[PDB]
Amino acid sequence: GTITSQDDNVVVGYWHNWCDGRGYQGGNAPCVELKTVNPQYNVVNISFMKVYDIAEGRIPTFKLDPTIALSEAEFIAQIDTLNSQGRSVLIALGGADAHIELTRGDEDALAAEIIRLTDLYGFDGLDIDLQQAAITAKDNQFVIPAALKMVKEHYRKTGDNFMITMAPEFPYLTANGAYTPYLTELDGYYDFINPQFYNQGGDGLWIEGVGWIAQNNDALKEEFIYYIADSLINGTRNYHKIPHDKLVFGLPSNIDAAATGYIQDPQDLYKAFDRLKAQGQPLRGVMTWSVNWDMGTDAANNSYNQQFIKDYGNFIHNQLPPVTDMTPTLSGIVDTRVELDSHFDPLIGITAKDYQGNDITADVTVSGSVNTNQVGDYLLTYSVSSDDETTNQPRKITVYEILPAFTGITDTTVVIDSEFDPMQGVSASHPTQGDLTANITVTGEVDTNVVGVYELTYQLFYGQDNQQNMTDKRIVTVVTDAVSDDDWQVGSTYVKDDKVTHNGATWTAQWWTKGEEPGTTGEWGVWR
Ligand SMILES: CC(=O)N[C@@H]1[C@@H](O)[C@H](O[C@@H]2O[C@H](CO)[C@@H](O[C@@H]3O[C@H](CO)[C@@H](O[C@@H]4O[C@H](CO)[C@@H](O[C@@H]5O[C@H](CO)[C@@H](O)[C@H](O)[C@H]5NC(C)=O)[C@H](O)[C@H]4NC(C)=O)[C@H](O)[C@H]3NC(C)=O)[C@H](O)[C@H]2NC(C)=O)[C@@H](CO)O[C@@H]1O
Numbered sequence: 001g002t003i004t005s006q007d008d009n010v011v012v013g014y015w016h017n018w019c020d021g022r023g024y025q026g027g028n029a030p031c032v033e034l035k036t037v038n039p040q041y042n043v044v045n046i047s048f049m050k051v052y053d054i055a056e057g058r059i060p061t062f063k064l065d066p067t068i069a070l071s072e073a074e075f076i077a078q079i080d081t082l083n084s085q086g087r088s089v090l091i092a093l094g095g096a097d098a099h100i101e102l103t104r105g106d107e108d109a110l111a112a113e114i115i116r117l118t119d120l121y122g123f124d125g126l127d128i129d130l131q132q133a134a135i136t137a138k139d140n141q142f143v144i145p146a147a148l149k150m151v152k153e154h155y156r157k158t159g160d161n162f163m164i165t166m167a168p169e170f171p172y173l174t175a176n177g178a179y180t181p182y183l184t185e186l187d188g189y190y191d192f193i194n195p196q197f198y199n200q201g202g203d204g205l206w207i208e209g210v211g212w213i214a215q216n217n218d219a220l221k222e223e224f225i226y227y228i229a230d231s232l233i234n235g236t237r238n239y240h241k242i243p244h245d246k247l248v249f250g251l252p253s254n255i256d257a258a259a260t261g262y263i264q265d266p267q268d269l270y271k272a273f274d275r276l277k278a279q280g281q282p283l284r285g286v287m288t289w290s291v292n293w294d295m296g297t298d299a300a301n302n303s304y305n306q307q308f309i310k311d312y313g314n315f316i317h318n319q320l321p322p323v324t325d326m327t328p329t330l331s332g333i334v335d336t337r338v339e340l341d342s343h344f345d346p347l348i349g350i351t352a353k354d355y356q357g358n359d360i361t362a363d364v365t366v367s368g369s370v371n372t373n374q375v376g377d378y379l380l381t382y383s384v385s386s387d388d389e390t391t392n393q394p395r396k397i398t399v400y401e402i403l404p405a406f407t408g409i410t411d412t413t414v415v416i417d418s419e420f421d422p423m424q425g426v427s428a429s430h431p432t433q434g435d436l437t438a439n440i441t442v443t444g445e446v447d448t449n450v451v452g453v454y455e456l457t458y459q460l461f462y463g464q465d466n467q468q469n470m471t472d473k474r475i476v477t478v479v480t481d482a483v484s485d486d487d488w489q490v491g492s493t494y495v496k497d498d499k500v501t502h503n504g505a506t507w508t509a510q511w512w513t514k515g516e517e518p519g520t521t522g523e524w525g526v527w528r
């Protein structure tokens with residue numbers, strides 16, 4: 001077949017490239033032939049493309065499991081059958097426990113291998129299902145998008161829409177989260193995203209005014225679906241925006257398919273989707289891990305017997321076609337701190353794209369102005385318009401000033417008649433004004449001829465016209481080098497004629513003493 005893409009709603013189902021997988025509740029997922037997958041799965045994702053052995057190098061590939069007892073030619077024939085029915089068959093990249101680790105420069109080879117596989121098997125696109133370390137490993141976040149742009153562009157040349165989808169686990173979809181480079185680099189290139197709303201336990205989101213709604217909360221499942229979808233399709237509540245026409249809700253087929261996330265009561269999904277439709281934002285479909293689980297058995301060897309497609313196929317297909325959200329995007333805008341009098345350029349680092357991923361950076365406009373010569377906050381708003389839609393985003397610029405620092409102003413003791421230079425070892429600096437030593441004045445003097453304690457007040461003047469100032473005080477004590485009688489000690493014993501220094505005076509013992517303080521023994525006592 002040819003490249004077969006989906007224009008309307010989708011029910012996506014992963015297909016296991018292996019047999020008899022064990023379920024989270026002890027069930028079993030048989031391998032199944034593609035031609036047996038229920039027709040209402042209009043996108044079927046071959047799982048998985050990955051590195052099958054590092055002796056083949058870093059570029060991942062796909063190798064059909066022969067125990068499924070499809071020859072290569074037969075597998076190709078069943079893909080062609082699905083394509084003849086207008087269904088798409090994508091190759092899923094990654095999966096659980098698949099490590100992929102690419103280096104900048106691997107993008108040409110990855111693209112070449114994607115195309116090779118696509119042309120050989122009849123695949124219609126590729127699903128990004130990077131998990132754990134593979135999301136962020138080495139240069140993956142650059143290489144994988146770059147490769148896929150090439151692949152898209154290669155098939156566009158012949159008028160074919162090579163589909164690109166992704167299956168991020170929903171916790172990675174916060175605004176600056178690990179999947180964000182894939183989503184932003186491929187804006188305009190991807191057909192839809194089918195996040196996983198399973199296996200995340202008690203993770204979820206905080207709804208200001210209703211509380212924490214967890215993915216494992218079966219009492220609040222309607223609210224979970226509604227609010228996490230509402231946040232995603234509007235870029236609110238700290239989630240990255242995925243337009244509603246491009247959001248497909250991923251679910252486990254049953255309790256064996258994933259540890260948590262199974263919808264016990266399909267009504268909760270019907271109602272959440274209906275609510276989303278009611279505010280003008282119908283979703284694009286559902287996704288499931290997996291067709292094999294939908295055709296599998298539980299631990300008691302009872303058949304699941306297609307309960308997932310029974311619950312969701314007709315509901316999702318019997319909907320109007322999607323309506324494209326053509327809002328443009330802005331990238332690069334972050335509140336920024338700028339030091340007083342530095343240069344600031346409000347356009348550097350900021351870019352914009354239309355909904356098809358075309359660069360429209362030159363079309364951005366900015367209102368507001370920053371005055372880097374005055375500390376304070378300044379608010380800018382960036383705007384861009386395309387396709388009769390407009391996106392805006394604020395940016396706070398804070399102008400701040402840093403105090404200079406003195407060095408060398410430490411209390412010190414010097415000997416009588418020594419030379420003392422109050423500026424010796426003293427400096428000031430500032431990060432932007434540089435050496436400010438010449439801006440320091442000294443109030444007070446030290447007289448090194450006269451024993452005593454001398455205070456010096458250092459002032460630094462800085463800033464515009466030197467009208468800012470800071471002060472620091474220093475004590476310089478001048479001590480004699482004159483040797484004197486040893487200080488009186490309260491525990492020492494003295495005898496007649498012994499002399500001691502105490503309380504600034506020299507005293508002479510008149511007889512035996514221990515523990516009597518000089519100066520306190522009166523007109524006629526032991527110390528005189
Ligand atoms: C206490 C609490 O609430 N804790 C929370 C955490 O649980 C949670 O973090 C998640 O933690 C779970 C493990 O507890 C971790 O689980 C993986 O989930 C991924 C994503 O769904 C699973 O991968 C997909 O799901 C199916 C299985 O449901 C995968 O199917 C398997 O595929 C392999 C081949 O690749 C086969 O060998 C297997 O047989 C097959 N399994 C089955 C049953 O068929 C499929 O490959 C994946 N892709 C898709 C499209 O479905 C992965 O299997 C789960 N691993 C395990 C060991 O169970 C999940 O990834 C953690 N999430 C994160 C973000 O790290 C956090 C989340 O914030 O919150 C709490 O802390």
Ligand code: NA
Nearest residue numbers: 002003122123
């Ligand atoms: Na095809």
